[PDB]
Design a protein around this ligand. Structure first.
Ligand SMILES: Nc1nnc(SCCn2c(=O)oc3ccccc32)s1
Length: 167
């Protein structure tokens, strides 16, 4: 039993809700919130910009130190950093950005990072400003993640389309 509320159950382990991931994280304080990161951990917009803004830029400050020490992530890769005021940990996961021409096959590799955590609050990887089809992202999520994932979808119209088209 966990404190995630109002989710529709898609499969044994995947749940979905129309919600602002920032507000969901502040309410639930999950062990892990997933960020839709880029390789430079530059949290300018989309989910990343919103999460970072909610931390009063502390996420960006921590991320800049991480990059200065370790260099960029790989597309499909991840790192665990602080969750600040939103969660215990933030799993920064880099899905491919279609608007950069990155290989959509890397989306499965990106979702594999979720399997290192028993429970996560997450957005759909590569959706939004990353340019991929969110219906495809949900399919890859369901077929790749085996741990318990609670997906927050900001756009109500998109949420309804994802549910109604889910096989
Ligand atoms: N594995 C999980 N992580 N985060 C959640 S949600 C937030 C509240 N919370 C809960 O309901 O169960 C919990 C177990 C440990 C820590 C927090 C818990 S479940």
């Amino acid at each position: 039993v966990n404190s995630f509320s109002g989710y529709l159950k898609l499969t044994d382990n995947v749940y979905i809700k129309n919600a602002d991931i920032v507000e969901e994280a502040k309410k639930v304080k999950p062990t892990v919130v997933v960020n839709a990161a880029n390789v430079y951990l530059k949290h300018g917009g989309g989910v990343a910009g919103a999460l970072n803004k909610a931390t009063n830029n502390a996420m960006q400050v921590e991320s800049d130190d991480y990059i200065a020490t370790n260099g960029p992530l790989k597309v499909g890769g991840s790192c665990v950093l602080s969750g600040h005021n939103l969660a215990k940990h933030c799993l920064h996961v880099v899905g491919p950005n279609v608007n950069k021409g990155e290989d959509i096959q890397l989306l499965k590799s990106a979702y594999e990072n979720f399997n290192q955590h028993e429970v996560l609050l997450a957005p759909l990887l590569s959706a939004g400003i990353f340019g991929a089809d969110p219906i495809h992202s949900l399919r890859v999520c369901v077929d790749t993640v085996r741990t318990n994932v609670y997906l927050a979808v900001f756009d109500k119209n998109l949420y309804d389309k994802l549910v109604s088209s889910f096989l």
